[PDB]
Amino acid sequence: IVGGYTCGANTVPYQVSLNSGYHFCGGSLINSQWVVSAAHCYKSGIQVRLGEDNINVVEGNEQFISASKSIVHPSYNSNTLNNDIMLIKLKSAASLNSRVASISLPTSCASAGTQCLISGWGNTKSSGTSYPDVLKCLKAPILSDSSCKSAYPGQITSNMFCAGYLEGGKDSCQGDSGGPVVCSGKLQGIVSWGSGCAQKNKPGVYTKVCNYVSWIKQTIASN
Ligand SMILES: [Ca+2]
């Protein structure tokens, strides 16, 4: 997260770190057994780390649980990043409490101008490179579809939205990938892609979670 703030320990209780020897992506806990992340975060051997603040120090609220199964969206295209969403099932159910909690799925899509909270352990410099140990946060609005498409001609599908600041300086970044965009208590976005980070006229692009709720629910129901 570039241009954000220190969230505070366990103030984003649905935020997970995906670990394969090291943090490599964020994710969001959506029930005791399932995490939503980006398909471009797929790899084998994932340990889901819940309850984290400093990802380099055991502070007392962590739950480390290996993934049993990952399911990349059937239609994910890694060249365009269309349908950049994946589900991860935990080998055992997380213990839910105020510091480890699921985030609700949307019942409705969010509109341009909606304020959201974006969070993660990604780079805090554009590029520029500095990786934080504690969780970082950014409040940012959803941008209009037309400004999103104008920023990234030919690249924005119906499964993506832009959020952030066209002036630059405030964005998600590498290592935030897969993490949440939460708006009014609902998971509306997944950190997906962008041109660099925090660059003028290149806002963050996010997977549009409301399009996927039916797939998420039916996948959980049968797995
Ligand atoms: Ca920790």
Instruction: State which residues have CB under 5 angstroms from ligand 1, the bound ion.
Output: 52, 54, 59
184 is catalytic: no
Query: Ramachandran region of residue 192, left (φ > 0), alpha (ψ -120 to 50) or beta?
Result: alpha
Q: Which of 23, 40, 53, 70 is catalytic?
A: 40
- The rounded distance, in Å, linking the Cα atoms of 223 and 212 is 16
Domain co-membership, 74 together with 165 = no
Method of determination? X-ray
Q: Give distance in angstroms: CA of 59 to centre of ligand 1.
A: 5
Question: 70: domain CATH number?
Answer: 2.40.10.10
40 is catalytic: yes
Domain co-membership, 194 together with 114 = yes
Q: What is the tally of structural domains in the chain?
A: 2
DSSP secondary structure code for residue 2 in this structure: B
Domain co-membership, 112 together with 193 = yes
- For residue 115, the one-letter residue type is Q
Residue 136's contacts (CB-CB under 8 Å, 6 or more residues apart) are 1, 4, 5, 6, 7, 119, 120, 121, 122, 124
Residue 1 DSSP SS3: coil
- Where in the sequence is the domain holding 187, given as residue range(s)? 1-12+103-210
Domain co-membership, 79 together with 157 = no
